């Protein structure tokens with residue numbers, strides 16, 4: 001069930017694949033990033049091939065596609081992180097139990113940005129000791145979403161009289177979304193790792 | 199890929215099925231409980247049929263069987279909870295975000311007698327206590343400690359290859375803690391009284 005464009009892994013479960021500039025795959029990610037980070041320079045873009053994370057994520061997507069019926073449940077978003085976090089995210093994905101309190105909090109979960117410029121802030125993509133910054137391009141199952149609130153440990157219910165039927169994620173603003181928060185494992189697949197510098 | 203002992207769900211994805219007293223499945227689950235809790239009165243046992251939770255759980259079980267290079271990754275454990283949390287656990291399973299002296303995960307007991315304490319299975323206004331029988335992917339485990347947010351690494355020369363769960367005592371475990379969604383499937387709900 002692994003995507004057929006992935007490199008052969010020789011029955012290995014995990015692989016990072018360096019992309020070539022001028023390939024459509026590299027160029028689409030570069031254009032998405034430079035739309036709002038034209039003042040930074042990309043060192044490299046690696047495709048993340050993680051069989052187990054992919055499998056769990058694709059099971060969740062199919063469940064949300066069945067439950068929501070005729071919705072675009074997936075967006076491509078950005079996530080800046082520190083170099084210390086990269087090994088863990090590459091193997092295990094995004095753990096809400098490890099998430100920082102955001103400067104504007106819409107709930108206790110993992111935060112993903114619409115614009116690379118948000119994730120490019122030193123507060124999220126902290127420069128390592130060689131001055132490299134790290135940002136993931138992430139498939140996120142945002143599904144049906146509402147404006148979040150600082151107290152949330154799960155998405156709120158759609159209906160107060162049915163407390164277990166939940167929104168899929170929350171946002172800062174439903175009309176003009178700039179960030180999404182997710183509260184469950186395997187709701188986000190880290191697809192690419194951008195390494196960049198001033 | 200829904201198990202054989204489940205009953206038909208008329209094309210729905212979630213239902214709670216009351217077990218018939220005196221039949222094989224009811225007798226099997228009652229005996230697990232009464233091993234340590236024979237002084238308690240059983241009102242009913244329900245089979246939890248949650249297609250989505252089962253699917254996600256089965257994927258994690260297949261992945262752990264590959265990673266550990268053997269079966270024997272699954273244990274049947276108990277979880278006592280309050281009446282107000284029962285609809286959430288039936289629909290969404292166990293959530294670490296909702297005493298945590300062996301880590302910030304979900305706690306499961308080897309013995310029903312431990313989960314039957316009023317501190318976990320809080321009596322509701324009518325005296326009814328609630329306990330799940332849970333399939334748990336305990337896998338390879340180590341001793342836990344306060345403040346863990348994931349299990350420790352097997353070798354701190356490879357800090358991303360983790361233990362699957364933690365316990366109070368590795369030689370004679372009486373409880374297990376898991377730190378990831380869909381590492382536990384709530385299989386039966388026992389309603390009982392002191």
Ligand SMILES: NC(=O)c1ccc(OCC2CC2)cc1
Nearest residue numbers: 277278305306307313318373
């Ligand atoms: N909810 C439960 O059934 C349960 C709760 C706690 C527990 O271990 C607590 C540990 C001694 C500190 C096991 C099970």
